[PDB]
Each structure stands twice: as C-alpha cells, then as structure tokens.
Amino acid sequence: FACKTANGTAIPIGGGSANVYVNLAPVVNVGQNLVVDLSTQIFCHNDYPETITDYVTLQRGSAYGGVLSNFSGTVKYSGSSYPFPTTSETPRVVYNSRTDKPWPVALYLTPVSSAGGVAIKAGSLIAVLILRQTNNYNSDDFQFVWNIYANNDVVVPT
Ligand SMILES: COc1ccc(C#CCO[C@H]2O[C@H](CO)[C@@H](O)[C@H](O)[C@@H]2O)cc1
C-alpha cells in the first residue's frame, strides 16, 4: 500500500507525510460552501490484493489558519458527511486493487458570520488530513499525513 498525489508526490509503503497544493474558489459568501476536493489530488493502491485487503480511514481531519478562524465545515468521506474538524475516525474504505484509486475526501467549508475580507491566505495551510492504513493480513498500521495548502487567497465579500 502506497499513495501519490496528482503532483507526483509519493508516500511509500510504511507511511509518511506530503504536501498538497490546491486551487480554491477565489470568492465565497457567508453561508455558502468552499469545496476542497481531494479525490482528484490523492491516490492510493494495494500492492498485494491477491492475499491482502487494505483498510483506509480518515483518522483525523484538522482545520488550520483561516479555515479554523473563518469557516465551519463538514468532510465527505466516500460521499457521506461528517463534522470537520473531525470528532472521530471515519469508516474504512477497502482498497483491493493494484490500480490507483482516489482517496474519496472532500471538504465543505462555510464562512461563518464573523468572516469578511481575506479569509484564507495564499500559501497557507488549510487542513491536515491523516489517512490511516491497516489491513486484514498482518499488523501494519501506518499514517499517511497530508498537509493541504491554498495556492491563492480566498475572499469573503462584505
Ligand atoms: C507470506 O508471504 C508474503 C509475501 C508478501 C507479503 C507482502 C506485502 C506488501 O505489503 C505492503 O502492501 C500491502 C498491500 O497493499 C500492505 O497491506 C502492507 O501494509 C504493505 O504496504 C506478505 C507476505
């Protein structure tokens, strides 16, 4: 089991960490969602599906910077909604293919009433998403830590 981003940034067998740089909608109103789709950004595969099934969760999703300050959120994992920042580990997604498949995570971030003006700064960390991989075969238990950064400012009109 290993993962790589659309940017080609790899985290090998055994886990690790990687930075992910995303383009965000430039303008988002209070009450509406900024959508951060990681399913086009992060991909993983199973190296031995003949014998092993990999189990993959979002163990923890944390908000940072302008997202923590200016937004409330949910995360969709495999299309189902949970609080973001997370308050528990998600259900597991089974990874049974040697072909890469997306990690099915998207954030839906709504500016709160206090927000206005520049709500997320270009270059800033918006989220850390911890992918946890275990399996049905041995004791492997590894974290693939994804730091998510904004490529551009996000403005909340006033
Ligand atoms: C008994 O003979 C064996 C021969 C090969 C293997 C193996 C293997 C590959 O392991 C990797 O790939 C597995 C499948 O993706 C993961 O579950 C592991 O955590 C790890 O990343 C295990 C047992």
Side-chain angles (χ1 to χ4, degrees):
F1 183 88
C3 299
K4 69 178 189 260
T5 71
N7 198 41
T9 311
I11 304 179
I13 287 165
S17 60
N19 298 338
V20 182
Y21 298 91
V22 298
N23 299 307
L24 299 176
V27 177
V28 183
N29 280 304
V30 171
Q32 302 303 312
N33 280 321
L34 174 62
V35 180
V36 189
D37 184 17
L38 290 317
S39 75
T40 56
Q41 300 300 308
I42 300 168
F43 303 85
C44 305
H45 78 280
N46 179 330
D47 283 297
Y48 190 19
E50 294 84 1
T51 296
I52 307 184
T53 289
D54 290 314
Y55 298 132
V56 171
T57 63
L58 175 66
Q59 178 175 37
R60 189 163 58 247
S62 305
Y64 296 91
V67 171
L68 192 61
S69 290
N70 297 312
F71 295 76
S72 65
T74 57
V75 54
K76 275 189 169 182
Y77 194 60
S78 185
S80 299
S81 297
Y82 305 92
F84 180 83
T86 61
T87 52
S88 64
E89 174 176 35
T90 62
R92 72 203 188 180
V93 170
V94 297
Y95 279 73
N96 280 308
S97 65
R98 195 172 267 113
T99 46
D100 278 355
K101 94 171 163 182
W103 191 39
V105 181
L107 310 174
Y108 298 85
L109 307 170
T110 300
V112 298
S113 68
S114 66
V118 181
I120 297 171
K121 294 178 183 195
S124 73
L125 182 74
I126 62 167
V128 174
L129 307 173
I130 301 182
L131 183 163
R132 183 183 181 188
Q133 176 246 328
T134 51
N135 66 39
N136 70 345
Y137 179 75
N138 62 22
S139 62
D140 287 1
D141 193 335
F142 300 131
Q143 289 184 332
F144 291 71
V145 179
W146 310 98
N147 301 325
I148 317 299
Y149 301 89
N151 283 343
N152 55 279
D153 285 349
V154 177
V155 167
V156 175
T158 50

